[PDB]
């Protein structure tokens, strides 16, 4: 449940996390910029090339599609029914199928599939600390607004390190309360809402204790501030990082010409 990294050897694993994260944001941006059918063919080709390059079995992608498949089909069907034009095919009182509606449903399912595939390739093919460092680096432009990014990086790091510990603490607290006789799912709305205080209040107080202890520790080891501190973990650009950008640029060129424009 915690973490989704899957080790391997393919070259996508060697792409620097900042370059990969920028490529994913850029792919999400360039999804918007595709309307014509050949443009969606280009999106499909590039997404499937990236997926076949990451060298993963289809079951992890299916695991990434299963939670939100119902919303995918519901939205695709709503788009097909809402927009009508051309051949009418099967008809009803208001449910009017159409060739334009069918192709629009397909062209929204394509957007769903590509967004899911690219996001899953990000989450699966890079370590959580690597993504944390990538985001702490991407937050650099905020230095121009005089806001402090050292505080944000520290808060992200502490929260990321304490998510699993607090999850174990939470499940232990629920186990103790269930052993006392609590029922966390049955009894109506009022009972189901009253039975969340025992889940939270001991967790909140344990969080207060952990916060005080960790603040004392960091203050005792010499945390004067986030300015004037080197770093232990660093991200260094490689030659393989030229592979995304050259890819990431090429896609753009096609959408300059391939779409209706």
């Amino acid at each position: 449940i915690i973490g989704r990294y899957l080790p391997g050897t393919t070259f996508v694993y060697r792409v620097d996390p900042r370059a990969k994260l920028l490529t994913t944001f850029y792919f999400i941006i360039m999804i918007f910029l595709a309307n014509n059918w050949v443009s969606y063919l280009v999106i499909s080709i590039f997404g499937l090339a990236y997926v076949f390059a990451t060298g993963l079995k289809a079951r992890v992608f299916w695991d990434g599609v299963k939670p939100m498949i119902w919303m995918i089909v519901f939205t695709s069907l709503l788009q097909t029914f809402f927009m009508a034009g051309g051949k009418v095919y099967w008809h009803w009182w208001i449910f009017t199928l159409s060739s334009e509606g069918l192709i629009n449903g397909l062209y929204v399912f394509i957007r769903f599939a590509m967004i899911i595939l690219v996001s899953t390739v990000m989450t699966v093919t890079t370590k959580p600390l690597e993504i944390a460092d990538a985001m702490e680096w991407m937050l650099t432009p905020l230095k121009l607004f005089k806001v402090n990014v050292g505080m944000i990086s520290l808060v992200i790091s502490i929260a990321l390190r304490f998510v699993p510990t607090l999850f174990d603490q939470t499940v232990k607290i629920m186990n103790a309360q269930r052993s006392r006789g609590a029922d966390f799912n049955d009894g109506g709305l009022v009972k189901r809402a009253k039975s969340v205080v025992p889940m939270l209040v001991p967790l909140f107080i344990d969080s207060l204790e952990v916060a005080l202890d960790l603040s004392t520790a960091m203050e005792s080891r010499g945390y004067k501030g986030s300015e004037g501190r080197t770093r232990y973990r660093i991200l260094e650009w490689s030659k393989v990082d030229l592979i995304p950008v050259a890819y990431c640029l090429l896609l753009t060129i096609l959408m300059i010409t391939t779409r209706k424009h």
Partner: protein, 278 residues
């Protein structure tokens, strides 16, 4: 009489054997104590008593109820009434407004009448030694040694029968530890089993009647502590500790004092020393 038949829990690439073939029949009314090295699955076996977990393939006979791998979560509010678990840091489960309401939050879940629940909570705060005027203070406003006592009076007020305790006196002062152990040793006297899980071995030697030794998720020895601490070689081979009195007696036997009997407790060791010098 608690009975376990081929009980075995498993955690996928991370399939871990958290527990293996267990074959034991705990009797009723005996201060059973669980021992084993760190990571020996004492807590996993402990959580099978109130069916918080469920055996992967086996059978549990607990307090007259039967637990099987397919048994659902419905109908357990009449088992967890007869089997109460006090986790390691029980003081980290207090949440209510006042100590009395926190203590009676236990019985209120098991169909106790409000007046009956309040009277039971008052009785069991009086028994655990909590102060009379400390009843209505906020549970978060007390010390550690008082939070622990409130928590212990919380998972024990509705008079369970197969109570299991994961180190109830981990961080108490020696007077408090002695008081809690006497409370439990007196609680079983009324006819309730007090299964205990302690890495400490002096109080197990002093109080416990049955000892369950767990090695790497499997029961290895189950007998009285008089017949478990007989040879130090086995205990040192299976990572188990030894009570201080037994270790001192073994060390003294090197000088050749030929101590009669088998001392386990400090008064017993002192009496054995006195009887030997004659």
């Amino acid at each position: 009489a608690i009975k376990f038949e081929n009980v075995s829990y498993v955690y996928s690439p991370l399939e871990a054997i958290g527990l293996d073939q267990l074959n034991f029949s705990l009797e009723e009314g005996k201060f059973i104590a669980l021992v084993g090295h760190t990571g020996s699955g004492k807590s996993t076996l402990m959580q099978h008593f109130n069916a918080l977990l469920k055996p992967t393939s086996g059978k549990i006979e607990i307090a007259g109820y039967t637990i099987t791998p397919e048994t659902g979560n419905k109908g357990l509010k009449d088992l967890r009434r007869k089997v109460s678990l006090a986790f390691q840091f029980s003081e980290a489960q207090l949440f209510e407004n006042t100590v009395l309401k926190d203590v009676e939050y236990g019985p209120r879940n098991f169909g106790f009448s409000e007046d009956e629940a309040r009277e039971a909570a008052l009785k069991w705060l009086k028994k655990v030694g909590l102060k009379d005027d400390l009843i209505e203070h906020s549970p978060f406003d007390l010390s550690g040694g008082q939070m622990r006592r409130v928590a212990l009076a919380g998972v024990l007020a509705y008079e369970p029968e197969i109570i299991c305790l994961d180190e109830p006196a981990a961080g108490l002062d020696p007077m408090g530890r002695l008081e809690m152990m006497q409370l439990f040793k007196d609680y079983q006297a009324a006819g309730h089993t007090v299964i205990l899980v302690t890495h400490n071995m002096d109080d197990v030697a002093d109080y416990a009647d049955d000892v369950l030794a767990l090695e790497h998720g499997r029961l290895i020895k189950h007998a009285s502590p008089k017949e478990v601490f007989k040879d130090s070689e086995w205990l040192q081979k299976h990572h188990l500790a030894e009570p201080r009195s037994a270790r001192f007696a073994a060390k003294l036997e090197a000088a050749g004092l030929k101590l009669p009997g088998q001392p386990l407790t400090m008064p017993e060791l002192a009496d054995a020393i006195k009887q030997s010098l004659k």
